[PDB]
Amino acid sequence: KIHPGVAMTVVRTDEILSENILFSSRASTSMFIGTPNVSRREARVDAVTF
Amino acid sequence: EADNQIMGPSSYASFVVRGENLVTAVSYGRVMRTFEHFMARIVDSPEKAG
Amino acid sequence: GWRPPVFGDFLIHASSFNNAEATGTPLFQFKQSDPFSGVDAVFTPLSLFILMNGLTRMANLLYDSPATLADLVPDFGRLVADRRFHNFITPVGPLVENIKSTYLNKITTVVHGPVVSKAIPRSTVKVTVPQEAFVDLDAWLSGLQPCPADARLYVALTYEEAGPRFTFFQSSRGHCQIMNILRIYYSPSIMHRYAVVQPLHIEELTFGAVACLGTFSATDGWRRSAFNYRGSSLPVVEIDSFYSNVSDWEVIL
Amino acid sequence: QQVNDYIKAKVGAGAPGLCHGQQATCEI
Amino acid sequence: NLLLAFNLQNALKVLCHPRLHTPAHTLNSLNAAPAPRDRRETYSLQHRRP
Amino acid sequence: PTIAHGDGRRPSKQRTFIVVKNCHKHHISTEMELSMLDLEILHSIPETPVEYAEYVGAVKTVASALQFGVDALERGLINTVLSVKLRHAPPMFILQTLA
Amino acid sequence: VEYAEYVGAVKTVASALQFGVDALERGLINTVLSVKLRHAPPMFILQTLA
Amino acid sequence: IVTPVTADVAYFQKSNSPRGRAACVVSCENYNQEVAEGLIYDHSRPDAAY
């Protein structure tokens, strides 16, 4: 426990879970809704996927 | 405040491609949103101050 | 979704093939000289460890006596002299069906195509090899290396001073550098072979032969199942979605 | 080699379990 | 709320590394600059044999 | 607009700002599975009540798959809207002085 | 098309005249507020004078 | 339970097992006794408290 010639500063990082509050004003964003589309991707001996 | 209610619209505002948009879509690859507004502003009432 | 796999039918005598073997181990076929319509003389890798000499305890519990196997391959000691034994081990693929008979036995495997059974509308299966005598050559030498689509299982059969031994290698990079990385891997065992090279003549110089069994669905990995035989406690790596495409034996040195 | 082995062994030497949480890396 | 000790011994896992001791990168970052300090310093620097 | 002031400073001419705002396009994907035996009896019409019961199980499975499809699309709608609202929200400690 | 250039021209000159007149109203309010502020002593001086 | 005379006082001030080490096993993953002995009896690795 003998002091060395040099001192030191220690740096760390921490995570904190935060529940936030979000405010938004009226007519802030315009959204355009398209038409959904269907495709067939994997046909397997058991079951087929869309 | 015992309100817990709002009156809102039950459906999206529809915007569809009309034929006047469609000729510009095919011919030049451009559409303008509600073409009829722009044509009524330009060619029908020329001045119509803002 | 692909075309159904080309099955192959085989009639083995039942004394050189256990009924107890799990559905999906790969099998290897040996060519007999004058009669071959009768006994196909197919091998499993656990049998190959006995014909070449806690895996050893299981390999002796399943297979007892060996001289039937020594009769099936009479010239094994002459083939290891000349490096011609790899010219007879052909790869056939993983096991699917085992119709039980007293003298004969009916083995049905998958030569080529996605591995599957045939009775119902094509219930799939998996291919299993034990984790010992198995070396992942992706964790062996390890910016960021890219993540490829597809992974290849190779087989190598190597004539060390304690006889020949087989290994299965799992990588995903390419065929043109798996040879070079496999030379880098078998460098120290090569360093132990050239003690008694100088009296022996030109044919012995070959160190082993490499084939490419197939391409299984990568970006997933494998699992670690076991054997449920009586005394077993035998860990076995299993892989799904396997597509068999046995290759030729390419020489390494 | 001996001195480096000594220095590596004395100071420098996954975790089985932790009670407090995700450890924080300390830099000096 | 468990009291903990930060000590020199725990701090040695960075203090016992070659990147402290070797000067070559410090020297390289120091001399690869356009203008160094005025080069007038001359005294002891190397021993001169009689 | 501007202000005229009696001060000796130069008056500044009329000015306009022309500003462009650009779209963002977002992409949403969902997946459904359907059994082959399930798709088998759908084409034929049942004659014995056992086939009738298997058919009314089959159509309920397919309706469940479609129900999950459209519900997952609604969740994608709400989730993408909430995300776009979040991405352009500055925090209070910056924005309070700027407003 | 020259008529469209004409109506754009008269819209331009009309806005460029409204700019001047509205800036003159702002000149009015700025000068009157300045005259009020020029004769406004602060509170602590005025309170003991009241 | 006998104990060193230089055991730390603050160790008793907080909730701790008398063993000198924590004994929580729910921290480690399920169904592996080797990792559990690593938490309990292994002195290669530090305890889960200090």
XYZ file of C-alpha atoms in Angstrom:
630
model
C 0.000 0.000 0.000
C 2.799 2.419 -0.877
C 1.707 5.345 -3.053
C 3.208 5.239 -6.565
C 4.598 8.341 -8.206
C 1.471 9.006 -10.274
C -2.202 9.558 -9.436
C -5.018 8.418 -11.698
C -8.504 9.371 -12.836
C -11.020 6.619 -13.546
C -13.704 6.891 -16.236
C -16.760 4.622 -16.473
C -20.033 4.497 -18.393
C -23.507 3.703 -17.074
C -26.850 2.735 -18.603
C -30.152 3.921 -17.110
C -33.613 2.753 -18.133
C -35.850 5.791 -18.595
C -39.588 5.909 -19.133
C -40.083 8.997 -21.262
C -42.934 11.324 -22.122
C -43.461 12.316 -25.756
C -45.394 15.434 -26.707
C -46.667 16.044 -30.227
C -48.671 18.874 -31.774
C -51.663 18.616 -34.103
C -51.043 18.511 -37.891
C -47.353 17.832 -37.316
C -47.010 15.098 -39.921
C -48.868 13.974 -42.999
C -49.015 10.224 -43.616
C -49.831 8.541 -46.927
C -51.208 4.996 -46.777
C -50.680 2.721 -49.767
C -52.129 -0.656 -50.719
C -50.631 -3.871 -49.290
C -49.321 -6.579 -51.600
C -49.098 -10.370 -51.438
C -46.183 -12.567 -52.512
C -45.241 -16.239 -52.123
C -41.746 -16.926 -50.836
C -41.079 -20.466 -49.568
C -43.002 -23.500 -50.749
C -41.932 -26.384 -48.527
C -43.009 -30.023 -48.368
C -44.726 -29.165 -45.068
C -46.156 -25.671 -45.487
C -45.994 -22.670 -47.792
C -45.160 -19.101 -46.752
C -46.576 -15.753 -47.851
C -61.415 16.681 -16.052
C -64.247 14.315 -16.946
C -64.116 14.603 -20.722
C -62.357 11.366 -21.933
C -63.908 11.763 -25.416
C -63.107 13.544 -28.698
C -64.970 13.735 -32.031
C -62.808 12.500 -34.882
C -63.120 11.370 -38.494
C -64.013 7.758 -39.146
C -62.061 7.444 -42.396
C -58.942 8.541 -44.240
C -59.065 11.400 -46.722
C -59.017 9.781 -50.158
C -56.602 10.934 -52.855
C -56.798 8.938 -56.080
C -55.216 9.337 -59.516
C -57.606 10.930 -62.003
C -57.170 10.850 -65.790
C -55.796 14.396 -65.919
C -53.092 13.288 -63.508
C -52.766 10.067 -65.503
C -51.828 11.680 -68.830
C -49.035 13.563 -67.068
C -48.018 10.345 -65.288
C -47.699 8.427 -68.544
C -46.345 11.241 -70.716
C -43.815 12.922 -68.412
C -43.594 10.834 -65.246
C -44.962 13.588 -63.001
C -48.212 14.039 -61.105
C -49.258 17.120 -59.174
C -51.477 16.755 -56.130
C -55.018 17.836 -57.036
C -54.220 19.076 -60.566
C -57.751 20.507 -60.783
C -56.876 23.149 -58.164
C -53.915 24.360 -60.214
C -55.863 24.439 -63.469
C -58.768 26.295 -61.834
C -56.277 28.799 -60.432
C -54.331 29.320 -63.661
C -56.682 29.111 -66.618
C -60.135 29.948 -65.191
C -59.770 32.956 -62.852
C -56.406 34.501 -63.797
C -55.958 37.106 -61.072
C -57.799 35.714 -57.968
C -55.550 37.503 -55.444
C -54.205 35.311 -52.651
C -39.469 -26.782 -52.972
C -36.802 -28.286 -55.209
C -37.177 -31.549 -57.135
C -37.446 -34.646 -54.876
C -34.051 -36.161 -54.075
C -32.670 -39.095 -56.028
C -32.824 -41.997 -53.594
C -30.525 -44.991 -53.759
C -31.339 -48.517 -52.658
C -28.798 -50.858 -51.077
C -28.831 -54.462 -49.840
C -26.264 -55.012 -47.093
C -25.723 -58.155 -45.081
C -27.018 -57.489 -41.597
C -23.912 -58.564 -39.667
C -21.822 -55.601 -40.884
C -24.492 -52.953 -40.187
C -26.346 -52.372 -36.927
C -30.093 -51.813 -36.813
C -29.586 -49.542 -33.792
C -27.958 -46.733 -35.813
C -29.735 -43.370 -35.818
C -31.626 -42.140 -38.876
C -29.348 -39.689 -40.672
C -25.724 -40.830 -40.277
C -23.799 -40.649 -43.577
C -22.767 -43.953 -45.129
C -19.783 -44.912 -47.282
C -19.701 -47.705 -49.852
C -16.910 -50.167 -50.663
C -16.449 -51.906 -54.000
C -15.973 -55.686 -54.085
C -14.111 -57.377 -56.910
C -15.837 -60.404 -58.376
C -19.321 -60.463 -56.649
C -21.014 -57.162 -55.852
C -24.694 -57.859 -56.559
C -24.941 -59.681 -53.232
C -23.278 -57.702 -50.435
C -22.772 -53.981 -50.909
C -20.283 -53.764 -47.972
C -21.332 -50.245 -47.007
C -19.495 -48.589 -44.113
C -20.501 -46.068 -41.466
C -17.763 -43.811 -39.972
C -17.897 -45.633 -36.622
C -17.225 -48.860 -38.522
C -14.386 -47.145 -40.374
C -12.727 -46.320 -37.050
C -12.753 -50.059 -36.288
C -11.448 -51.112 -39.713
C -8.586 -48.601 -39.391
C -7.909 -48.753 -35.588
C -14.909 -42.491 -25.262
C -15.580 -43.215 -28.931
C -13.586 -46.454 -28.859
C -15.781 -48.014 -26.166
C -18.955 -47.326 -28.172
C -17.310 -48.478 -31.406
C -16.448 -51.754 -29.667
C -19.871 -52.095 -28.006
C -21.734 -51.816 -31.318
C -19.321 -53.858 -33.455
C -17.923 -57.105 -32.004
C -15.209 -59.277 -33.619
C -13.745 -57.792 -36.435
C -12.616 -60.457 -38.954
C -15.774 -60.190 -41.071
C -14.785 -56.560 -41.714
C -11.195 -57.687 -42.342
C -12.600 -60.176 -44.857
C -14.598 -57.427 -46.604
C -11.460 -55.310 -47.054
C -8.680 -57.914 -47.326
C -6.057 -55.648 -48.912
C -6.291 -52.762 -46.414
C -2.668 -53.197 -45.366
C -1.647 -53.232 -49.015
C -3.799 -50.189 -49.792
C -2.317 -48.093 -46.962
C 1.121 -48.837 -48.416
C 0.179 -47.539 -51.849
C -2.336 -44.782 -50.866
C -5.117 -46.454 -52.851
C -7.687 -46.919 -50.077
C -9.193 -43.463 -50.595
C -9.910 -44.503 -54.210
C -12.498 -46.990 -52.916
C -14.288 -45.051 -50.175
C -17.071 -43.457 -52.076
C -19.492 -41.103 -50.320
C -23.178 -41.958 -50.510
C -25.021 -39.638 -48.107
C -27.109 -39.747 -44.942
C -29.420 -42.571 -43.951
C -33.201 -42.511 -44.379
C -34.742 -45.990 -44.352
C -33.643 -49.277 -42.792
C -35.942 -52.167 -43.671
C -35.111 -54.968 -41.254
C -34.163 -58.431 -42.500
C -32.261 -61.322 -40.904
C -29.510 -62.105 -43.431
C -29.791 -59.163 -45.817
C -30.741 -55.626 -44.791
C -32.320 -52.847 -46.851
C -30.581 -49.472 -46.635
C -32.131 -46.482 -48.414
C -30.127 -43.237 -48.381
C -29.996 -39.933 -50.282
C -27.449 -39.701 -53.090
C -28.342 -36.139 -54.076
C -30.942 -33.523 -53.191
C -32.512 -32.173 -49.983
C -32.675 -34.848 -47.294
C -36.162 -36.218 -46.654
C -38.273 -39.334 -46.019
C -40.709 -40.764 -48.555
C -43.791 -42.300 -46.877
C -45.908 -39.262 -45.851
C -45.696 -36.036 -48.003
C -41.937 -35.818 -47.475
C -41.162 -35.497 -43.789
C -37.662 -34.077 -43.422
C -34.703 -35.548 -41.491
C -31.304 -34.384 -40.239
C -27.718 -35.609 -40.596
C -25.644 -36.459 -37.514
C -21.906 -36.919 -36.862
C -20.141 -37.207 -33.491
C -18.390 -34.128 -32.132
C -15.161 -35.945 -31.439
C -13.217 -36.676 -34.649
C -14.873 -33.464 -35.887
C -13.052 -30.142 -36.197
C -14.709 -26.843 -37.039
C -12.207 -25.097 -39.281
C -13.972 -21.742 -38.779
C -13.130 -21.467 -35.085
C -9.597 -22.713 -35.731
C -8.085 -19.539 -37.198
C -10.074 -16.918 -35.299
C -11.924 -6.066 -41.250
C -14.768 -8.334 -40.192
C -14.955 -11.401 -42.422
C -18.144 -11.445 -44.540
C -21.102 -13.681 -43.757
C -21.653 -16.014 -46.738
C -24.879 -17.676 -47.810
C -23.973 -21.326 -47.667
C -21.748 -23.698 -45.695
C -19.886 -26.791 -46.920
C -19.089 -30.041 -45.110
C -15.870 -31.640 -46.374
C -14.357 -35.024 -45.567
C -10.646 -35.846 -45.309
C -8.940 -39.202 -44.778
C -5.369 -38.973 -43.542
C -2.654 -41.625 -43.217
C -0.824 -40.813 -40.009
C 1.823 -42.960 -38.323
C -0.965 -44.555 -36.268
C -2.767 -45.599 -39.436
C -5.410 -43.685 -41.368
C -8.006 -41.494 -39.645
C -10.931 -39.560 -41.095
C -12.078 -36.049 -40.245
C -15.110 -33.935 -41.152
C -14.642 -30.191 -41.661
C -17.289 -27.461 -41.588
C -16.497 -24.154 -43.276
C -18.317 -21.623 -45.422
C -15.724 -19.563 -47.299
C -14.716 -21.330 -50.509
C -13.360 -24.468 -52.083
C -10.231 -22.820 -53.467
C -8.899 -21.851 -50.028
C -10.271 -24.642 -47.844
C -7.455 -26.715 -49.381
C -4.836 -24.194 -48.259
C -6.357 -23.784 -44.805
C -6.488 -27.579 -44.523
C -2.763 -27.789 -45.338
C -2.203 -25.146 -42.635
C -4.281 -27.304 -40.280
C -2.509 -30.591 -41.044
C 0.965 -28.977 -40.978
C 2.043 -30.416 -37.560
C 0.793 -33.936 -38.268
C 2.762 -33.730 -41.528
C 5.786 -32.761 -39.402
C 5.406 -36.099 -37.545
C 5.181 -38.276 -40.673
C 8.559 -37.669 -42.353
C 10.601 -39.663 -39.836
C 10.700 -42.844 -41.950
C 9.991 -41.269 -45.352
C 13.444 -41.705 -46.903
C 13.684 -45.545 -47.337
C 10.146 -45.686 -48.719
C 9.626 -44.866 -52.405
C 7.565 -42.412 -54.454
C 3.982 -43.688 -54.014
C 3.785 -43.045 -50.268
C 4.109 -39.234 -50.467
C 0.350 -38.544 -50.610
C -0.955 -37.400 -47.213
C -4.706 -37.562 -47.766
C -7.688 -36.860 -49.956
C -10.520 -34.344 -49.680
C -14.095 -34.585 -50.915
C -16.983 -32.138 -50.526
C -20.083 -33.812 -49.151
C -22.652 -31.057 -49.372
C -23.969 -27.603 -48.579
C -26.155 -27.161 -45.531
C -28.168 -24.040 -44.727
C -25.672 -21.640 -43.163
C -26.113 -18.608 -40.832
C -27.675 -20.993 -38.276
C -25.079 -23.314 -36.776
C -25.661 -26.750 -35.327
C -26.945 -28.398 -32.155
C -25.586 -31.021 -29.736
C -27.750 -34.103 -29.333
C -26.601 -37.422 -27.910
C -26.928 -41.167 -28.343
C -29.646 -42.944 -26.391
C -28.029 -46.366 -26.485
C -27.788 -48.181 -23.109
C -24.306 -47.123 -21.976
C -23.730 -44.404 -24.581
C -23.508 -40.819 -23.154
C -22.178 -40.024 -26.609
C -22.409 -36.395 -27.814
C -23.260 -35.934 -31.491
C -23.508 -32.798 -33.631
C -26.666 -32.675 -35.769
C -27.427 -30.430 -38.758
C -30.698 -29.701 -40.585
C -31.666 -28.711 -44.141
C -28.860 -30.701 -45.705
C -28.275 -30.916 -49.453
C -25.951 -33.756 -50.452
C -23.545 -33.286 -53.355
C -20.674 -35.731 -52.822
C -17.517 -34.680 -54.652
C -14.297 -36.334 -55.842
C -11.240 -36.988 -53.669
C -8.855 -34.066 -54.170
C -5.311 -34.732 -52.979
C -3.644 -32.697 -50.212
C 0.013 -32.354 -49.251
C 9.781 -14.374 -21.762
C 10.151 -15.095 -18.036
C 9.545 -11.494 -16.958
C 6.545 -11.100 -19.261
C 5.118 -14.408 -17.988
C 5.559 -13.196 -14.401
C 3.878 -9.830 -15.052
C 1.028 -11.533 -16.923
C 0.546 -14.110 -14.161
C 0.639 -11.798 -11.122
C -1.690 -8.986 -12.206
C -3.252 -9.813 -15.542
C -4.226 -13.436 -14.738
C -17.230 -15.870 -18.913
C -18.273 -14.843 -15.422
C -20.293 -17.580 -13.664
C -22.824 -15.212 -12.136
C -23.294 -11.630 -11.063
C -25.575 -10.186 -8.393
C -25.427 -6.456 -9.053
C -25.885 -6.225 -12.818
C -23.981 -5.471 -16.007
C -20.410 -4.601 -15.098
C -18.980 -1.239 -16.118
C -15.612 -1.090 -17.829
C -13.216 1.190 -15.944
C -10.484 3.003 -17.850
C -7.601 4.793 -16.182
C -25.337 0.696 -1.859
C -22.485 -1.708 -1.144
C -19.267 0.091 -0.251
C -16.432 -0.768 -2.637
C -12.710 -0.100 -2.716
C -10.743 1.095 -5.719
C -7.080 0.318 -5.129
C -3.732 0.396 -6.926
C -3.657 -3.411 -7.229
C -6.973 -3.579 -9.087
C -5.674 -0.659 -11.156
C -2.605 -2.564 -12.367
C -4.387 -4.439 -15.221
C -3.724 -1.331 -17.338
C -0.659 -0.154 -15.413
C 1.257 -3.322 -16.314
C 1.175 -3.089 -20.097
C 3.847 -2.219 -22.717
C 1.783 0.653 -24.198
C 2.778 2.723 -21.173
C 6.473 2.226 -21.486
C 7.485 2.335 -25.142
C 8.015 5.841 -26.588
C 8.125 5.099 -30.326
C 4.599 6.233 -31.182
C 4.908 9.319 -28.929
C 8.170 10.110 -30.713
C 6.558 9.555 -34.114
C 3.556 11.760 -33.353
C 5.929 14.383 -31.974
C 8.371 14.602 -34.894
C 5.946 14.083 -37.803
C 4.663 17.635 -37.352
C 5.782 20.491 -39.670
C 7.419 22.727 -37.057
C 8.868 21.424 -33.777
C 10.106 23.581 -30.898
C 13.075 25.877 -31.612
C 15.980 23.457 -31.854
C 18.489 25.488 -29.831
C 18.959 23.003 -26.965
C 22.566 21.814 -26.685
C 24.271 20.541 -23.526
C 25.042 17.016 -22.111
C 23.020 15.092 -24.719
C 25.720 12.554 -25.541
C 28.930 11.864 -23.640
C 32.156 12.948 -25.334
C 35.146 10.683 -24.661
C 38.544 12.231 -23.840
C -41.440 41.839 -44.113
C -39.201 44.572 -42.675
C -39.426 47.749 -40.610
C -38.400 51.249 -41.561
C -36.381 52.949 -38.844
C -35.272 56.567 -38.652
C -31.690 55.435 -37.887
C -29.016 56.048 -40.532
C -28.721 52.330 -41.383
C -29.410 51.134 -44.911
C -32.896 49.794 -45.594
C -32.875 46.202 -46.768
C -34.704 45.036 -49.884
C -37.643 42.647 -50.136
C -36.726 39.054 -49.281
C -38.246 35.615 -49.783
C -37.206 32.171 -48.582
C -37.977 29.084 -50.666
C -37.890 25.858 -48.668
C -38.008 22.233 -49.838
C -39.352 19.411 -47.663
C -38.747 15.818 -48.775
C -40.692 12.573 -48.307
C -39.757 9.475 -46.362
C -40.886 6.033 -47.515
C -41.209 3.178 -45.033
C -41.493 -0.537 -45.695
C -43.470 -3.094 -43.700
C -43.413 -6.883 -44.004
C -45.475 -9.685 -42.455
C -45.395 -13.455 -42.976
C -48.040 -16.197 -42.994
C -47.846 -20.002 -43.185
C -50.393 -22.388 -44.706
C -50.390 -26.180 -44.522
C -50.610 -28.308 -47.672
C -53.196 -30.707 -46.214
C -55.142 -27.610 -45.145
C -55.167 -26.293 -48.722
C -56.116 -29.777 -49.966
C -59.752 -30.119 -48.775
C -60.619 -26.458 -49.502
C -61.266 -27.071 -53.210
C -63.526 -30.098 -52.773
C -66.972 -29.865 -51.161
C -67.677 -32.333 -48.308
C -70.232 -35.158 -48.514
C -69.844 -37.064 -45.217
C -70.112 -34.967 -41.978
C -66.533 -35.885 -40.963
C -65.222 -34.087 -44.063
C -67.613 -31.243 -43.199
C -66.079 -30.904 -39.726
C -62.542 -31.066 -41.138
C -63.495 -28.349 -43.647
C -64.933 -26.035 -41.003
C -61.717 -26.511 -39.031
C -59.679 -25.757 -42.164
C -61.447 -22.507 -43.054
C -61.119 -21.279 -39.467
C -57.352 -21.911 -39.572
C -57.062 -19.935 -42.826
C -59.260 -17.129 -41.440
C -57.011 -17.004 -38.371
C -53.960 -16.636 -40.639
C -55.611 -13.736 -42.495
C -56.711 -12.179 -39.180
C -53.128 -12.219 -37.897
C -51.995 -10.758 -41.222
C -54.225 -7.700 -41.088
C -53.711 -7.202 -37.337
C -49.929 -7.315 -37.814
C -50.361 -4.715 -40.551
C -52.241 -2.464 -38.104
C -49.455 -2.910 -35.528
C -46.945 -2.004 -38.225
C -48.968 1.143 -38.995
C -49.032 2.339 -35.385
C -45.407 1.337 -34.762
C -44.010 3.167 -37.800
C -46.049 6.290 -36.987
C -44.758 6.310 -33.400
C -41.181 5.763 -34.612
C -41.314 8.673 -37.077
C -42.742 10.853 -34.294
C -39.832 9.827 -32.073
C -37.021 10.326 -34.617
C -37.653 14.060 -35.118
C -38.186 14.913 -31.442
C -35.394 16.915 -29.797
C -35.021 16.633 -26.020
C -36.130 19.384 -23.647
C -32.709 20.416 -22.388
C -31.607 21.397 -25.876
C -34.925 22.640 -27.239
C -36.106 24.789 -24.305
C -33.662 27.610 -24.939
C -33.993 27.273 -28.734
C -37.775 27.700 -28.767
C -48.409 32.289 -72.072
C -47.589 35.998 -72.293
C -50.831 36.533 -70.378
C -49.571 34.192 -67.650
C -46.337 36.178 -67.571
C -48.501 39.318 -67.330
C -50.504 38.096 -64.340
C -47.303 36.896 -62.660
C -45.851 40.352 -63.294
C -48.764 42.217 -61.733
C -48.769 39.822 -58.751
C -45.061 40.567 -58.300
C -45.484 44.341 -58.381
C -48.541 44.173 -56.095
C -46.639 42.214 -53.446
C -43.648 44.524 -53.874
C -45.942 47.473 -53.102
C -47.671 45.815 -50.121
C -44.197 45.177 -48.670
C -43.470 48.905 -48.624
C -46.818 49.931 -47.154
C -46.711 47.290 -44.409
C -43.118 48.244 -43.566
C -44.352 51.821 -43.250
C -46.940 50.742 -40.681
C -44.127 48.982 -38.834
C -42.211 52.259 -39.011
C -45.181 53.984 -37.343
C -45.374 51.535 -34.441
C -41.576 51.442 -34.010
C -41.279 55.224 -33.791
C -44.174 55.611 -31.342
C -42.846 52.855 -29.060
C -39.406 54.479 -29.226
C -40.873 57.871 -28.244
C -42.532 56.210 -25.255
C -39.268 54.525 -24.252
C -37.238 57.740 -24.608
C -39.239 59.445 -21.853
C -39.455 56.433 -19.500
C -37.374 56.745 -16.321
C -36.961 53.531 -14.307
C -38.958 52.563 -11.252
C -36.539 53.068 -8.344
C -35.827 56.625 -9.427
C -39.476 57.526 -9.884
C -40.934 55.924 -6.742
C -39.337 58.250 -4.194
C -40.139 61.167 -6.514
C -43.836 60.268 -6.381
C -19.037 -19.804 12.858
C -15.420 -18.839 13.529
C -14.115 -15.910 11.503
C -10.908 -13.875 10.978
C -10.448 -10.951 13.325
C -9.737 -8.670 10.343
C -13.004 -9.437 8.564
C -14.424 -6.124 7.407
C -17.006 -4.402 9.590
C -19.005 -3.003 6.655
C -19.488 -6.555 5.371
C -21.758 -7.192 8.354
C -23.512 -3.842 8.016
C -25.316 -5.008 4.858
C -27.328 -8.097 3.953
C -24.833 -10.904 3.350
C -24.574 -14.626 3.938
C -22.253 -15.592 6.827
C -20.130 -17.660 4.402
C -18.021 -14.694 3.321
C -19.420 -15.048 -0.214
C -22.763 -14.602 -1.901
C -24.666 -17.792 -2.701
C -27.166 -16.711 -5.376
C -27.433 -19.355 -8.094
C -30.378 -17.861 -10.034
C -27.785 -15.487 -11.535
C -26.182 -18.352 -13.422
C -27.974 -20.136 -16.242
C -30.193 -23.101 -15.432
C -29.173 -26.772 -15.210
C -25.364 -26.466 -14.949
C -23.846 -27.450 -11.626
C -20.270 -26.603 -12.689
C -21.077 -22.906 -13.118
C -22.894 -23.137 -9.785
C -19.770 -24.400 -7.988
C -17.931 -21.608 -9.785
C -20.231 -19.169 -8.042
C -20.130 -20.956 -4.695
C -16.725 -22.462 -3.963
C -14.365 -21.256 -6.704
C -11.734 -18.791 -5.524
C -10.122 -18.404 -8.935
C -12.853 -15.933 -9.796
C -14.133 -13.272 -7.378
C -17.463 -13.469 -5.609
C -20.604 -11.821 -6.917
C -20.565 -9.096 -4.247
C -17.134 -7.478 -3.745
